Amino acid sequence: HVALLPSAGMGHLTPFLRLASLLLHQHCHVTLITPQPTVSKAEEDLLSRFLSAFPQVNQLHFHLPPPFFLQFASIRSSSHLLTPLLSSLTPPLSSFIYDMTLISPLLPIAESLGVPHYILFTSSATMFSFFSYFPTLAKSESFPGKLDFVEIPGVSVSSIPRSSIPPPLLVPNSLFGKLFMEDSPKLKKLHGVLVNTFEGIEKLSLEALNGGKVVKGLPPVYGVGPFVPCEFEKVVKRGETISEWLDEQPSGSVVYVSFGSRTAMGREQLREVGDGLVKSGWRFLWVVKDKDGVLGFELVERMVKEKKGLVVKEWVDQSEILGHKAVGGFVSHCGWNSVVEAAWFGVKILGWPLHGDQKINAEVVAKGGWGVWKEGWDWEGERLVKGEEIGEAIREVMNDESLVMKATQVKKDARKAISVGGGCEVALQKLMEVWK
Numbered sequence: 001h002v003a004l005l006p007s008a009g010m011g012h013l014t015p016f017l018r019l020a021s022l023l024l025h026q027h028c029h030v031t032l033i034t035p036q037p038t039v040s041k042a043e044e045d046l047l048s049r050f051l052s053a054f055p056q057v058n059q060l061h062f063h064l065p066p067p068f069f070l071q072f073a074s075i076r077s078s079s080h081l082l083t084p085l086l087s088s089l090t091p092p093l094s095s096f097i098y099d100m101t102l103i104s105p106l107l108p109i110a111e112s113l114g115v116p117h118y119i120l121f122t123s124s125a126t127m128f129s130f131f132s133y134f135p136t137l138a139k140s141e142s143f144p145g146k147l148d149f150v151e152i153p154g155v156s157v158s159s160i161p162r163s164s165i166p167p168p169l170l171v172p173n174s175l176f177g178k179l180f181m182e183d184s185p186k187l188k189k190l191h192g193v194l195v196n197t198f199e200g201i202e203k204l205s206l207e208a209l210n211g212g213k214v215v216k217g218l219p220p221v222y223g224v225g226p227f228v229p230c231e232f233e234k235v236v237k238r239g240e241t242i243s244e245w246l247d248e249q250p251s252g253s254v255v256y257v258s259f260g261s262r263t264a265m266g267r268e269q270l271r272e273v274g275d276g277l278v279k280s281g282w283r284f285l286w287v288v289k290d291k292d293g294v295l296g297f298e299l300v301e302r303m304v305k306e307k308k309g310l311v312v313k314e315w316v317d318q319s320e321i322l323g324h325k326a327v328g329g330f331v332s333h334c335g336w337n338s339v340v341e342a343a344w345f346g347v348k349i350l351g352w353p354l355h356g357d358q359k360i361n362a363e364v365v366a367k368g369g370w371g372v373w374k375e376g377w378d379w380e381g382e383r384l385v386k387g388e389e390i391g392e393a394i395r396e397v398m399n400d401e402s403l404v405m406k407a408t409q410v411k412k413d414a415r416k417a418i419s420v421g422g423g424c425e426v427a428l429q430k431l432m433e434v435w436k
C-alpha cells in the first residue's frame, strides 16, 4: 500500500500519476491524495481521466480552508489535517511518496506515520544535486559575491556557471532562497528520493548522488525514469485536426514548439518567435498559452501561403505530437517532463530556458549530444531574442544530423531502462523489497 501526494501544476501531477501507473503494474494499492480545490482545469481533466481509467486507486480529498503559488502556503499551513485522514486508512500504509516542494510540512506527518517515506523530485537528477549542494554553497559567505562556477563533484554537467543558477537563489530576502536552505537539509531524514531520469541522460549525477559525493548524509536516490506517457492522458478530441495535419508532412520536418504549461512570455517576445519560425523555413507546430493580436499580417500570411505552420491555443497531446514521425525537432523550455518525453521519442531539443532549473536542464541535454541551447539568450525578460537568432538556431538544429543520432540512442537507452535490465525496473523492484 503506497500513498502519493503531488504538488500543484501539471509539471508535478503528470510524473506522479505516471509513477502511480508503474506502481499499479507492480500490483499495488495506491492512495492518491488530492489537495482540493485543485488549481488548473487541466489538473481536473487529467485526474478524472486517470481515476476512471484506474478505479481501484484511493482518492483522499485534502480539503483546504480558503494561483499555483497560492495554495503553496495553504497546504503547509493545513498539513496537520492529513494525520487523522491517512492514519484512518486500511489496508495499512507501507510507504509514502510526496513532492519535494512539500518536504517541509509533510516530513513531521510522514515520521509520525511509521512508514518509509520518500520524495519524488519532478526535475533532473543534476538539478537535485544543485538542490542538495545548495547548503554547502551558501555556508561559504563569499556568495553571491564571488561565485563564478558551481562545481559539484561527479555530476553529469561539467561546471554550473553563475548564469545557470536560478536568479532568486542569489538575491537576499528571497522565498526560494530560504526554501532551499530549509528543505535541502531535511533530505537526511528520508528513506530515499525518486527521480524521473535514467542512466542514458544522467549517468554521472546519479552515481554522484548515490556515492555520497554531492553532500553527506544523502539517502539512496532511485532513477525510476523514464516516465513514459500513458493512455489515460490521451483526450478523445472530436476534431483531431493536429494529428491529421502532421500525417501529410514528410517525417522529420515539423518543429514542435512549446514553452511548458504557463508560458509567461510577453507580447514582444511572442512576435519574434513566430517571426523566427517562418524565417527558419521549416514547418512548425507552435503551442501557445495566453495565461490577442500578437502575430503579424505578413507573418500570418506566410504561415498560410507557404503552408507550413500550426498555431494552437489549447492543451495539446504532447505525447502524440512528439511520437508522430513528422516531428524532427523540439523547441522546448527544457521542463524536465518534456525533456524525458523528448528522450523517450528520440526528438532532438533546441533548448530555450526561461526560469528556474531550465538552464541546468538544458545543459544536461546538450551534454548528451542531442540538444543545443544558446547561453546568450539568458532568462526570460532579460533581453529580447530577435527572430533572426530563432530562425538561425532552428536551422542549426534541424540541419545538425548528429543530434538525431545521439537522440536515437538515448531513445534506445530509454527503451532499455524499463524492460531488460531497467534501472526503473530494478529500482522499483528494490523499493518493493524494503516495503515488506
Ligand SMILES: O=c1ccn([C@@H]2O[C@H](COP(=O)(O)OP(=O)(O)O[C@H]3O[C@H](CO)[C@@H](O)[C@H](O)[C@H]3O)[C@@H](O)[C@H]2O)c(=O)[nH]1
Pocket: 009, 010, 011, 012, 014, 122, 123, 124, 258, 259, 260, 261, 262, 287, 314, 315, 316, 317, 318, 319, 334, 335, 336, 337, 338, 339, 341, 355, 356, 357, 358
Ligand atoms: O500543451 C501541452 C503542454 C504541456 N503538456 C504536458 O505537460 C507536462 C509539462 O511538463 P514540463 O515540460 O516539465 O513543463 P512545466 O509544467 O512548465 O514544468 C515545471 O515543472 C518542472 C518539473 O518540476 C520543472 O522542471 C519546470 O521548470 C517547471 O516549469 C508534460 O507532460 C507535457 O507533455 C501537454 O501534454 N500539452
